[PDB]
Design an enzyme around this catalytic site. Sequence first.
Site, PDB file in Angstrom:
ATOM      1  N   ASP A  51       0.573  -1.279  -0.212  1.00  7.30           N
ATOM      2  CA  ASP A  51      -0.037  -0.058   0.083  1.00  7.30           C
ATOM      3  C   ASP A  51       0.746   1.052  -0.046  1.00  7.30           C
ATOM      4  O   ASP A  51       2.138   1.135   0.333  1.00  7.30           O
ATOM      5  CB  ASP A  51      -0.792   0.190   1.208  1.00  7.30           C
ATOM      6  CG  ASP A  51      -2.003  -0.973   1.485  1.00  7.30           C
ATOM      7  OD1 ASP A  51      -2.084  -1.878   0.569  1.00  7.30           O
ATOM      8  OD2 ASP A  51      -2.388  -1.034   2.612  1.00  7.30           O
ATOM      9  N   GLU A 298     -13.980  -1.301   6.111  1.00  8.12           N
ATOM     10  CA  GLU A 298     -14.462  -1.408   4.603  1.00  8.12           C
ATOM     11  C   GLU A 298     -15.744  -2.177   4.753  1.00  8.12           C
ATOM     12  O   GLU A 298     -16.019  -3.052   5.561  1.00  8.12           O
ATOM     13  CB  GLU A 298     -13.525  -2.301   3.612  1.00  8.12           C
ATOM     14  CG  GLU A 298     -12.176  -1.541   3.475  1.00  8.12           C
ATOM     15  CD  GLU A 298     -10.991  -2.700   2.918  1.00  8.12           C
ATOM     16  OE1 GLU A 298     -11.334  -3.790   3.576  1.00  8.12           O
ATOM     17  OE2 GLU A 298     -10.067  -2.069   2.485  1.00  8.12           O
ATOM     18  N   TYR A 414      -9.025  -9.936  -1.383  1.00  4.03           N
ATOM     19  CA  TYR A 414     -10.305  -8.879  -1.883  1.00  4.03           C
ATOM     20  C   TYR A 414     -10.738  -9.416  -3.173  1.00  4.03           C
ATOM     21  O   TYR A 414     -10.188 -10.002  -3.828  1.00  4.03           O
ATOM     22  CB  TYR A 414      -9.738  -7.552  -2.324  1.00  4.03           C
ATOM     23  CG  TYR A 414      -9.287  -6.629  -1.107  1.00  4.03           C
ATOM     24  CD1 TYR A 414      -8.860  -7.131   0.144  1.00  4.03           C
ATOM     25  CD2 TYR A 414      -9.619  -5.456  -1.111  1.00  4.03           C
ATOM     26  CE1 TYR A 414      -8.318  -6.372   1.249  1.00  4.03           C
ATOM     27  CE2 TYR A 414      -9.242  -4.590  -0.119  1.00  4.03           C
ATOM     28  CZ  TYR A 414      -8.824  -5.046   1.042  1.00  4.03           C
ATOM     29  OH  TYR A 414      -8.663  -4.348   2.273  1.00  4.03           O
TER      30      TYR A 414
HETATM   31  C1  5N6 Z   1      -4.167   1.317   2.859  1.00  4.30           C
HETATM   32  C2  5N6 Z   1      -5.597   1.589   2.185  1.00  4.30           C
HETATM   33  O1  5N6 Z   1      -5.795   2.667   1.833  1.00  4.30           O
HETATM   34  N1  5N6 Z   1      -6.340   0.481   1.970  1.00  4.30           N
HETATM   35  C3  5N6 Z   1      -5.740  -0.861   2.395  1.00  4.30           C
HETATM   36  C4  5N6 Z   1      -6.411  -1.457   3.554  1.00  4.30           C
HETATM   37  C5  5N6 Z   1      -6.249  -0.562   4.907  1.00  4.30           C
HETATM   38  O2  5N6 Z   1      -4.935  -0.385   5.029  1.00  4.30           O
HETATM   39  C6  5N6 Z   1      -7.060  -1.070   6.057  1.00  4.30           C
HETATM   40  O3  5N6 Z   1      -8.509  -1.398   5.773  1.00  4.30           O
HETATM   41  C7  5N6 Z   1      -7.018  -0.323   7.328  1.00  4.30           C
HETATM   42  O4  5N6 Z   1      -6.580  -1.189   8.347  1.00  4.30           O
HETATM   43  C8  5N6 Z   1      -5.250  -1.591   8.736  1.00  4.30           C
HETATM   44  C9  5N6 Z   1      -4.307  -0.915   7.931  1.00  4.30           C
HETATM   45  O5  5N6 Z   1      -5.054  -2.442   9.458  1.00  4.30           O
HETATM   46  O6  5N6 Z   1      -5.900  -2.840   4.043  1.00  4.30           O
HETATM   47  C10 5N6 Z   1      -4.995  -3.533   2.955  1.00  4.30           C
HETATM   48  O7  5N6 Z   1      -3.753  -3.200   3.249  1.00  4.30           O
HETATM   49  C11 5N6 Z   1      -5.434  -4.831   3.435  1.00  4.30           C
HETATM   50  O8  5N6 Z   1      -4.834  -5.922   2.773  1.00  4.30           O
HETATM   51  O9  5N6 Z   1      -5.855  -5.290   4.463  1.00  4.30           O
HETATM   52  C12 5N6 Z   1      -5.414  -3.441   1.612  1.00  4.30           C
HETATM   53  C13 5N6 Z   1      -5.976  -2.010   1.211  1.00  4.30           C
HETATM   54  O10 5N6 Z   1      -5.839  -1.282   0.063  1.00  4.30           O
END
Ligand code: 5N6
Length: 451
Positions: A51, A298, A414
């Site tokens: 990321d 998410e 995902y």
């Molecule tokens: C970094 C971002 O903007 N999105 C990413 C998301 C996110 O960092 C997470 O929702 C937050 O919580 C954590 C970092 O612990 O997490 C991922 O890194 C993953 O694979 O989990 C992939 C994804 O693009």
Amino acid sequence: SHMDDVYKTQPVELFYPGYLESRGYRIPALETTKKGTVLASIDVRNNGDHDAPNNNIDVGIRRKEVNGEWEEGKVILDYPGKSAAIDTSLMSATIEENGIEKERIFLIVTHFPEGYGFPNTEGGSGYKEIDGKYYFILKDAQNNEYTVREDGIVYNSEGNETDYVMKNDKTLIQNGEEVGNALLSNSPLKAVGTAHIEMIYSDDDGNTWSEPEDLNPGLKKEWMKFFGTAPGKGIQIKNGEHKGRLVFPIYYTNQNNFQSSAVIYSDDFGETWKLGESPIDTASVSSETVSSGTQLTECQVVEMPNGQLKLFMRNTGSYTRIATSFDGGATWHDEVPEDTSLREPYCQLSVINYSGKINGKDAIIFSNPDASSRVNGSVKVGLINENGTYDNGEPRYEFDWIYNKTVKPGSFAYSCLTELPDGNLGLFYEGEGAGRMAYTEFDLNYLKFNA
Ligand SMILES: CC(=O)N[C@H]1[C@H]([C@H](O)[C@H](O)COC(C)=O)O[C@@](O)(C(=O)O)C[C@@H]1O
């Protein structure tokens, strides 16, 4: 061998290392247009799977027209340097113009300047409100403040003109020459290191896309740090009081870095946007100030028959959380339960409406890694039953999970479902290994089958 009446395509790879010169790809998104085109958009993560920050990430998309083949991928949104556009969401929506139904495809994506990502984001909208107008903030290396105004003229904090202009693309011009770019971490004036949601749209069935519009100004609250697209799809409400409303799932963090799900919505076909409360917001708890308990991150949204919304959310607990809205996503019922059929390993998930009836009931399709970890990609079918009402007049919908099919026994991360014109389902998923983003198709019978 699968059973006789079953449809399942061997998975193909739509993006892989090297493709479009990118070393890395992640974050599948998949939507079907009213013309029956399938759109598959993705993070063109140029320097690897990692990321933001320290990644040149752009938005890529592929189209497959009905009874056509996957066309070549294009990068449709590109930012200077290692400024990132990360986590896309697609939404097909229509508006009755004359008496013609006109269709517009919307994409939203989270966007960060060079050096910034979820882990180190700063707070704020990135704008100063001066007499009702929102102005793009720039900072010098001594942390003074400037705003971008009329014609890209950069004013200082005292309120007077500097000898700087910022072009739309964040290019900085001083006395004739380009002296840098506001998104590059080496620029003399920099954008605030904070998360934005940017939107682009497509009027020609995905062929071409607008320039990005920052959705931050007037939307992201000054107290938020992270503010970002929940990757997958948005939806346009089909029926009920809020028919026509655009609904894009997002999540954000407060000053304590606590993560809350929500949706942004538009009633004027994407002209302006408003922020709904998080399911985290109750009279007990405010998502601004919360600092303990189950985080909701998410999320993806489905509409029930009367138009009521259901938001399914990645979270810190062991199972998927579902929130209900009676007002097109403005607010959620106070009660936010787990569904213990939907084991949630802390990963993005996909949930969608299905246009046809299944055992004479209305239905949603869900997919995620059904495990303690990102293994065992499973697609489930949920039948919707009414079972009571709320003190408030509206029906009380419940989920019967009749089918639960493994489509990927090993690694699965995902994914994003979409309903095909022919009534089948597409799935665009991570887990085929080696940066490879896989697409497969199947029918309802495939899901009925018990291994
Ligand atoms: C970094 C971002 O903007 N999105 C990413 C998301 C996110 O960092 C997470 O929702 C937050 O919580 C954590 C970092 O612990 O997490 C991922 O890194 C993953 O694979 O989990 C992939 C994804 O693009």
